[PDB]
Amino acid sequence: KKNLGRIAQIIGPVLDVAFPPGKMPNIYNALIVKGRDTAGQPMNVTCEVQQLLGNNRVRAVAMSATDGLTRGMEVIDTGAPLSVPVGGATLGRIFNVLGEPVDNLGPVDTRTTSPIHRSAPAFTQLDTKLSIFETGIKVVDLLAPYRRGGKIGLFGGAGVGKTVLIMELINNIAKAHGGVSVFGGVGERTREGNDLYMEMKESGVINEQNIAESKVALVYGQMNEPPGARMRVGLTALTMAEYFRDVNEQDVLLFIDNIFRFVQAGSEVSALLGRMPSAVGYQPTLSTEMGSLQERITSTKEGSITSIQAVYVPADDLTDPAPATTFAHLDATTVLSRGLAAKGIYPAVDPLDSTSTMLQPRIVGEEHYEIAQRVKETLQRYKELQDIIAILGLDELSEEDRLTVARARKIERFLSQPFFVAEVFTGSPGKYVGLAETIRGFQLILSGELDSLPEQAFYLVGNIDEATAKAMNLEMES
Amino acid sequence: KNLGRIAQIIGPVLDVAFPPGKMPNIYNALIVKGRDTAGQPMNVTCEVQQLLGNNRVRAVAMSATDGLTRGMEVIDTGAPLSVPVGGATLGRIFNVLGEPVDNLGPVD
Amino acid sequence: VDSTASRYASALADVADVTGTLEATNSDVEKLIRIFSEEPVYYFFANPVISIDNKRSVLDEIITTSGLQPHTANFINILIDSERINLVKEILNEFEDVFNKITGTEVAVVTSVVKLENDHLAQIAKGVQKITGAKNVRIKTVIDPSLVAGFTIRYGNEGSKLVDMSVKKQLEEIAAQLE
Amino acid sequence: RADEISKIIRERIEGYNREVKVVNTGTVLQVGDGIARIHGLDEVMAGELVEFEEGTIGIALNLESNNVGVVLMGDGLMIQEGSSVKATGRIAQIPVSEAYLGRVINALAKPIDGRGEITASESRLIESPAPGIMSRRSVYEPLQTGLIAIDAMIPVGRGQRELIIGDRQTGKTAVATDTILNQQGQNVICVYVAIGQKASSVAQVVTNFQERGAMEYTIVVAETADSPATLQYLAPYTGAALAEYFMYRERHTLIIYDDLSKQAQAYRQMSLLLRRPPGREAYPGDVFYLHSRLLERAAKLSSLLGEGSMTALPIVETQAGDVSAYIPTNVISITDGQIFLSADLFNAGIRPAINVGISVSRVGSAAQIKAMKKVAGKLKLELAQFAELEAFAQFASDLDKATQNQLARGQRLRELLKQPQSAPLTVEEQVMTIYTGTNGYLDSLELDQVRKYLVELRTYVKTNKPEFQEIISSTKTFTEEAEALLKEAIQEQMERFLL
Amino acid sequence: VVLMGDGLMIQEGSSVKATGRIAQIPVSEAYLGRVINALAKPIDGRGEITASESRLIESPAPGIMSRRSVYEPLQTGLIAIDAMIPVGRGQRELIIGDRQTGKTAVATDTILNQQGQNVICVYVAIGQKASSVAQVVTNFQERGAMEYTIVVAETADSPATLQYLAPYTGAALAEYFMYRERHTLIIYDDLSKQAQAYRQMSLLLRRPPGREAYPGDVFYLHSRLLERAAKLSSLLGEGSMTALPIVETQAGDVSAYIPTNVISITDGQIFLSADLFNAGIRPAINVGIS
Ligand SMILES: Nc1ncnc2c1ncn2[C@@H]1O[C@H](COP(=O)(O)OP(=O)(O)OP(=O)(O)O)[C@@H](O)[C@H]1O
Ligand SMILES: Nc1ncnc2c1ncn2[C@@H]1O[C@H](COP(=O)(O)OP(=O)(O)OP(=O)(O)O)[C@@H](O)[C@H]1O
Ligand SMILES: Nc1ncnc2c1ncn2[C@@H]1O[C@H](COP(=O)(O)OP(=O)(O)O)[C@@H](O)[C@H]1O
Ligand SMILES: [Mg+2]
Ligand SMILES: [Mg+2]
Ligand SMILES: [Mg+2]
């Protein structure tokens, strides 16, 4: 005997639903429109109450296409927020925003479901253990080491390598991970989700037979989806991540590509809700919508989520409010560059604009910390000299400033690395580089014992030994 | 054959109110029957830019609105600005309205 | 003028005009204005919080005692459904101006220091129908002492067009002696 | 608000004690700025086509509580206020059939080529859903553009979204046109959408298709700049739904959007007239979702659906090469690769002005055939060498034979890449051109001799030794039998071209 | 009405009572060592705070006669500050920089240095990540800095009304000790995030916006906040309140609206730059601008 609504208005994906005066749905509750098409009757238009409007009327945002909805259809209030299946039944499965399987398999076991709107963990239940986390990448392990159990951001514009670098952090880590990984695809290419679903199966992670032993749950709301769906994809993936943290008490990896598209979709429907926008046309509730996602990610004293997010940066502008509101939530930010990707240095990580909480001597060690400083002191000094050498060139620099230019020109190429994922672009095989290899490889450039080698010997080699073996062939071949 | 009334004059922009059925469509020329400084008739030509709803158009004047009064009669021409064409136009300077402003008589 | 209050009142007049209840509807509209003057009665209809269902029941009882016209009872019911009861007072006042237009009547205002006689009123009505073109002319009187002796009339579609000779002699003579 | 017009209100008073359904027809309240508000139509669906008395169609999109906002497809310059409207019942469709081949067509799929009516039996939705995560597979067939610089170095596969991006007058329409001209032998249906362009410019392209027989497998969806902003916003979704009729009927399809840039500015025009709050460069927030509804419909489908594909080549114009601009950066984040046509090369006569080092493709080696994977791999590494060797060339100025050879090789590698307009090269001819230029069989020629030599060399192999074409068209691999049979013809052509 | 919580259960048409009071805070000596909310309710999970009095959350500043000149040092332990940009008791010194440049670590080292200086410290953390606030509390409590420190924490999961009121919750605590002859230090970790919470509130109240859609009274937001930090005269017991606001900039853009406002309010600024930071100069005081 649920209360029954009628649709009053349809403006895009935003529906205004007229309810009886005694009973109104609460904010964030899900509504099921009856729905109708040419062939059949789909109840697959799920809504979500945003605003109570008055005159016994709510304002809801649809999670599907609203084409084919008529003013005056029956709307069913579910009485609860949007619930999603969680647990071991979600392992190996691709989901909608609505928690519904897309992978053309059997229906999921919905004995255990969970709402997508939950409060964050309490201040008491947090853990303060600062463990380092190794990724196999030379820019990442040296100059911005990642937080085991914390938020991590990959910043950069279009076509710089956020997706290729995030597929390297799945490749190096998620198979070596002792727990469940969760991928959340928010506003990305549906082709890229097809490749990841094949990369998981080919790597043995999503096994075709005995699918309940898979340790990856995929959640996809991509570019084609309506903007109300793409707001709630990240909350569907996060609800499934925080089941394994709270109930199964496992360490969880949470890859979300892209969380900018989570913001951009919340900006599009905020225009339809009639709200007064903030700077750059963004929604006024931007820091609260963004913080409602990121404060549910933090690790508890039961389990631990590590999230690696790709944050798209519009127009290469890190001062844009949607990149800027993300920086406050992150333990490590890996800013990718376009000027480095235009050179072909990959991963195109800006080594000075990429930061970390972890790069402190009580965490990384004293040997690691004193060399991460000396790389950044070298690349800062060469950053300052690129107005003198922009016009006059190298010829007018002093003996010391030419030596800092010479070493920093070798540091920048040894920061680059071939990836396993990028073996279909270049053909060269990727190299995992351990941190013990990374610290000693930059000890040699800063001590100057490899000043005789050419600079192209350091480009796209794993160890510093491969930079030595490449230096032979450039010196040998005549 | 339609008479409208000026509803408002805000700058060069006029709003003209029409009867409910007889109604100009967009880009038609409106001829505002105005009065001059001294007291002679002089007409102001306009062009419908917006149909505002409630039988009311929004027009942008082709001349000065200085001295127009809310409630003067406006002729709907039924067509946009028609301008003389031919060999009668050669050697002549014209207005926007197709009116000769070179003081050599009318365009025959 | 074309504002929401004016827009509704014009509709109400048009339906009366069609059905030939212009005299009959006008009396009812005047009757409504007495009803909605009261702060308590107006407040009950106007506020959003009181339930709409309750409002109709009370409204129906009010209509029965009032004995309003069949459309006039609808017109208020239409206002209530479409939320515009907060501007009933503007709408009712607006209707009077529209109602004069339909008849082709005009209104005039004449003011004096002391009360005056009916033949003066009829001759002012003659002059106002002359210079205005009332199909018919109408008249109102407001006694104000702070003038000297004259009469001021006020007419037009709005209360705009004004001619007088009481103190405009004196203020005119100040402004003519500064010349 | 819009409904309180006093005719609508007056009608209401008369019928208050009454039940009614005005669900069938409606009354136009106002027409202005590309949208019409319509009282009535109490049972239209969202996204339904509505019909007017003048014949203008509109898509019902803003279904408010008393009126309906209808997005006018066309000029509303005739729609009289108060006129009656009609709920069609159908929900934003174009008719689509096999009879669209050879036809130049509108955004409403009406013929504009003056050649009569077009018969159709089926329909397809304008806003139709993209293929899902399981309805796809990997892009593996090549789509051959005939331009050597694409087909060797930025190769486009079937099902790939590839961006053609550059400044104005840099040959963007040419790369799109020569790709359509190359699909003669293949079972690929091309669709050309011209959004907001010169009508003279579209008429040249249609005539170039008639002249070369490309208009037996091509639909041209033509809006002009004189056309209203809604039809320019609509026309890529029309041309994509023509291209989805063949995709889901197991055919392969090629869609070209000329100016996705001009669709973005027509939808910006629409939404600023709708008084919607914009963002960067005054584009609204739905600008990403504008072009990602469109380009996610391009997909290599799985074998469970029949393996249709749709290669989308959108064209985006940049302003002085601003890749950081909002509309190029949105489409780069949707597209699988991009082909940068640069204006320094176009002004230097390096047509097609393809900036090879900055142009990427996501399926590089998966697209190309095994002859192209084997032969053009040495092409990609030589231009990696020659890009660094053109640097410090004038600084050194004493060019030794470990460099002066590798530079004069690299200048004639560019002469391989120059093609004339509206003349593609077959895959046998591309693997024959890249083979000779990489080995150095052109080094004794001058820079004004390589272009004339290779034309005499491809005409030699068509006529005299056609067994080279038999190997590459059948085996699709650069065989040792094919390599020797080519070298024999290189020797004969050097003997002929000298004397 | 702007809500001090999420309005999820609130029903349209339900009743709502007016409390009679404006914005009070329970206040005592027992807040020392407690991590509290913007409502001064303890969120560290260590028991209820015994508090008898109350102060107003928006209480007025001391006047011109209620003060005296700033004459006593407040040592930060950073030789770059205590020699060239000195902060005294009663002074408002802004700490302004970019992201990840040393803003908190300057301000934390100030509180840690007050170990035997006999001052009360209040750390307000507006809009800051809860694992970042829990790491600051853990660093304080390990050194014994929590013996004299209050931490007021509003993380970004909280609604915007509580982030807006977190500095006024902290400053009303500081004025409890300033008026009882104690000297107090208050750090607002991210004033820029107080203004963005106040921008959100005023844009959902449908107030007309200004530069960067901030309301016009976002200057009066920080001015009535920071003018509360003062050194009182000898008649008022001569207690002090040193404010240390923190404002981030966008790659050093002080042409931005909120840093331009707060620089004009405080009694000086400490510029931390990222170029001096990466080149080894730590703490990265950009002195010629400071
Ligand atoms: N490969 C080529 N060889 C020779 N000429 C070419 C080639 N490609 C293009 N052109 C010439 O260059 C001119 C510009 O090309 P085109 O119009 O195709 O580019 P566009 O960028 O689409 O131009 P616009 O932006 O003005 O529409 C054309 O006149 C064409 O004749
Ligand atoms: N004097 C110093 N010596 C060495 N390292 C320092 C010094 N001051 C700050 N740091 C380092 O700077 C890093 C960033 O510091 P902090 O977080 O305090 O800056 P912030 O501006 O508050 O950053 P955010 O904007 O992320 O809040 C810290 O990890 C810290 O180790
Ligand atoms: N490590 C790498 N090596 C070679 N090329 C790369 C590498 N990383 C990225 N790229 C190039 O950049 C292109 C776009 O990168 P992508 O991950 O799509 O960027 P984004 O995530 O910003 O969209 C890739 O198609 C690839 O060609
Ligand atoms: Mg990407
Ligand atoms: Mg063109
Ligand atoms: Mg900090």
| Chain C residue numbers touching D17 (CB-CB < 8 A) | 74
What is the dihedral angle through the alpha carbons of D270, D275, D277, D280, rounded to the nearest 10 degrees? 40
**Is the backbone peptide bond immediately before D352 cis, with ω within 30 degrees of 0?**
yes
Q: Are residues C100 and C163 in the same domain?
A: no
Neighbours of D473 (CB within 10 A): 13
Give the closest-approach CA distance of C50 to chain D in angstroms.
Answer: 22
Spatial contact of B72 and B56, defined as CB atoms under 8 Å apart = no
- The subunits that touch chain C, with at least 3 C-beta pairs less than 8 Å apart, are A, B, D
Q: Is E135 in Cβ contact with A299 (below 8 Å)?
A: no
Cα Rg for chain C, rounded, in angstroms?
Answer: 21
Q: Give the residue, out of A425, A428, A432, A461, with the most ligand 3 atoms within 8 A of its beta carbon, to mutate for a pocket test.
A: A425
The verdict on whether A71 is a catalytic residue reads no
Q: Which residue of B has its CA nearest to D38?
A: B53
Query: Contacts from D180-185 at CB under 8 Å and sequence distance 24+?
Result: D180/D209, D180/D214, D180/D218, D180/D254, D180/D256, D181/D146, D181/D208, D181/D209, D181/D212, D181/D214, D181/D422, D181/D424, D182/D144, D182/D145, D182/D146, D182/D424, D183/D214, D183/D217, D183/D254, D184/D213, D184/D214, D184/D217
* Experimental method reported for this structure: cryo-EM
Ligand 1 and D172: CB distance under 6 A:
yes
User: For chain D, what is the largest distance between any 2 Cα atoms, rounded to a whole number of angstroms?
Assistant: 102
Cα within 13 Å of Cα(A288), Cβ side: 22
Cβ A407 vs Cβ A378: under 8 Å: yes
Cβ burial D112-121 (10 Å sphere, 16+ → b, else e): beeeeebebe
Which single residue is written with the structure tokens 């003056």? D114
CA-atom Rg of chain B in angstroms: 15
One domain for residues A472 and A427:
yes
Closest CA to A157 of A313, A349, A347: A313
Range list of H helices, A181-258: 190-202, 233-246
**C69 and C109 housed in the same domain:** no
- Domain-terminating residue out of A81, A114, A139: A81
Contacts of A38 (CB under 8 A, 6+ apart): none
Q: Is E50 in the pocket of ligand 2 (CB under 6 A)?
A: no
Which candidate, D217, D155, D160, places its Cα nearest to that of D186? D217
Q: Are strands E240-248 and E94-97 parallel, antiparallel or unpaired?
A: parallel
DSSP D155: P
Q: Which atom of ligand 3 is nearest to the CA of A312?
A: 22
- Listed in sequence order, the DSSP H helices in D122-219 are 148-153, 172-181, 199-211
Work out whether strand E94-97 and strand E119-126 pair parallel, antiparallel, or are unpaired: unpaired
Gaps in chain C (C to N distance exceeding 2.5 A) after: none
Task: Report, as residue numbers or ranges, the catalytic residues of D.
Answer: 362
Whether A190 and A235 share a structural domain: yes
Q: Could you tell me the residue range of the domain that residue B68 belongs to? A: 1-80
Q: What distance in Å separates the CA atoms of residue D155 and residue D371, rounded to the nearest whole number?
A: 13
Q: Which amino acid is at A262?
A: F
- Secondary structure of residue A386 in the 3-state scheme: coil
DSSP state of D65: S
Residue with tokens 């017991």: E237
Strands (DSSP E) along B11-105, which ranges? Answer: 13-17, 29-35, 41-53, 56-61, 73-76
Distance, C-alpha A252 to centroid of its chain: 14
- D172, amino acid identity: K
Q: Which residues of E are annotated as a binding site?
A: 97-104
DSSP 3-state of D283: coil
CATH number at residue A2: 2.40.10.170
Closest to D303 in 3D by CA, of D250, D371, D362: D250
Find the A196 Cα to ligand 5 centroid distance in Å. Answer: 37
| Cα separation of the two ends of chain A | 87
For chains A and C, count residue pairs whose Cβ atoms are closer than 8 Å.
5
On whether both C76 and C130 belong to a single domain, the answer is no
Concatenated DSSP letters for chain C? Answer: ---HHHHHHHHHHHHHHHHT-HHHHHHHHHHHHHHHHSHHHHHHHH-SSS-HHHHHHHHHHHHHHHT--HHHHHHHHHHHHTTGGGGHHHHHHHHHHHHHHHHTEE-EEEEESS---HHHHHHHHHHHHHHH--SEE--EEEE-SSS-S-EEEEETTTT-EEEE-SSHHHHHHHHHH--
Q: At residue A332, what are phi and psi to the nearest 5 degrees?
A: -145, 130
E189 ligand 2 Cβ < 6 A: no
Domain boundary among C61, C78, C104: C104
Determine, for residues C48 and A54 on separate chains, whether the beta-carbon distance falls below 8 Å. Answer: yes
Question: Which DSSP helix (H) or strand (E) runs through D380?
Answer: helix D377-390
**D444-453 CB burial, b ≥16 within 10 A, e <16:** ebeeeebeeb
What's the N-to-C CA distance of chain B in angstroms? 25
End-to-end CA distance of chain C: 39
Minimum-distance CB partner of D13 among C4, C7, C12: C12
Q: Sort out which chain A residues have CB atoms less than 8 A from C83's CB and list them.
A: 55
Chains E+B touching (3+ CB pairs under 8 Å) = no
Looking up tokens 């009886």 gives A20
- What's the maximum distance between 2 C-alpha atoms anywhere in chain C? 68
Q: Which helix (H) or strand (E) holds D457?
A: helix D450-463
Q: Which residue has the tokens 């230096």?
A: A471
CB proximity E34 to A under 8 Å: no
- CA proximity to E210, closest of A268, A281, A273, A279: A279
D239 close to D103: Cβ distance less than 8 angstroms? no
**C-alpha distances out from residue D220 to B11, D234, D295, E27, Å:** 46, 14, 18, 76
**C144, C154, C163, C167 from C170: Cα distances, Å:** 17, 20, 15, 5
Q: Judge contact between B87 and B69, C-beta under 8 A.
A: no
Give residues (CB < 6 A) around ligand 3.
A 156, 158-164, 346-347, 419, 422, 425-426; D 333, 360, 362
Write the DSSP string, A415-469. S----SGGGGTS-PPP----HHHHHHHHHHHHHTTTTTS-GGGGTT-SSSHHHHH
Say how far apart CA E183 and CA E87 lie, in whole Å.
14
Single out the residue in C104, C133, C159 at which a domain terminates: C104
Of D127, D133, D139, the CB nearest to A94: D133
Tokens coding E209:
């916006």
E177-192 as b/e, with b when 16 or more CB fall inside 10 Å?
A: bbbeebbbbbbbbbbb
Closest C-alpha to A63, from A105, A99, A88, A94: A99
C12 and C94 together in one domain: yes
User: How far is the CA of B77 from the CAs of B106, D193, E113, E194, in angstroms?
Assistant: 21, 39, 85, 60
Counting the structural domains of chain C, the total is 2
- The whole-angstrom distance between D290's CA and the closest CA on chain A is 10
- Contact yes or no for D13 and C10 at CB 8 A: no
Q: Chain E closest CA to A317's CA: distance in Å?
A: 10
Q: Mind listing the domains of chain D with CATH numbers?
A: 1-90 (2.40.30.20), 91-368 (3.40.50.300), 369-499 (1.20.150.20)
Strand A251-257, strand A131-133: pairing: unpaired
Enter the tokens of residue D17. 């004690």
Task: Write down the number of H helices and E strands in chain D.
Answer: 17, 15
Contact predicate D453/D443, CB 8 Å: no
Final residue belonging to a domain, choices C89, C104, C119: C104
Which helix (DSSP H) or strand (DSSP E) does residue A218 occupy?
strand A216-221
Virtual torsion, Cα B83, B87, B93, B96, nearest 10 deg? 10
Q: Which residue range(s) make up the domain with C91? A: 1-104
* Cα distance between residue C63 and residue C72, in whole Å: 9
The type of residue at A264 is: Q
Instruction: Give the number of other Cβ atoms within 10 Å of residue A68's Cβ.
Output: 18
Do C22 and C90 have their domain in common? yes
d(CA C108, CA C121): 10
State the DSSP H helix or E strand holding residue D93, giving kind and residue range, or none if neither: strand D93-96
Reading the block at residue C40, the tokens are 């308590």
Tokens at residue E12, please? 């349209």
**Among D200, D307, D205, residue whose Cα is nearest residue D246:** D307
> What value, to the nearest 5°, has the Cα angle with vertex D410 and ends D409 and D416?
90
D87 close to D78: Cβ distance less than 8 angstroms: no
3-state secondary structure of D371: helix
Instruction: Kindly state whether residues A385 and A330 are assigned to the same domain.
Output: no
Using CA atoms in the order E154, E155, E159, E163, what is the torsion angle rounded to 10 degrees? Answer: 40
Q: Is E138 helix (H, G, I), strand (E, B) or coil?
A: helix
Residues C67 and C5 in one domain: yes
Contact by Cβ (8 Å): E67, E241: no
Q: Are residues C137 and C78 in the same domain?
A: no
Statement to judge: residues C122 and C61 lie in one domain: no
| Angle between helix A435-447 and A366-384 (nearest 10) | 50
Tokens of B3: 């008479």
b/e per residue, C141-165, with b = 16+ CB within 10 A? beeeeebeeebbbbbeeeeeeeeee
Q: Please tell me what DSSP assigns to residue D170.
A: S
In B, which residues are within 8 Å of D74 by CB distance? none
- What is the count of structural domains for chain A? 3
The type of residue at D300 is K
C65 with C109, same domain: the answer is no
Burial class (CB in 10 A: 0-12, 13-18, 19+), A317: middle
A120 secondary structure, DSSP code: P
β-pair type (E119-126, E183-189): parallel
Please indicate whether, in this complex, the C-beta atoms of A377 and E138 are within 8 angstroms of each other: no
3-state SS of A302-332 is CCEEEEEEEEECHHHCCCCHHHHCCHHHCCE
CA distance A415 to C107: 90
Q: Do residues D464 and D489 touch, judged by C-beta distance below 8 A?
A: yes
d(CA D299, CA A192): 11
Determine if residue A141 is left, alpha or beta; phi over 0 gives left, psi from -120 to 50 gives alpha, anything else beta.
Answer: alpha
Whether residue C95 sits in one domain with residue C129: no
Question: Are residues C118 and C68 part of one domain?
Answer: no
Beta sheet of A94-95, edge-to-edge order? A94-95, A216-221, A180-186, A251-257, A304-312, A151-156, A332-335, A355-356
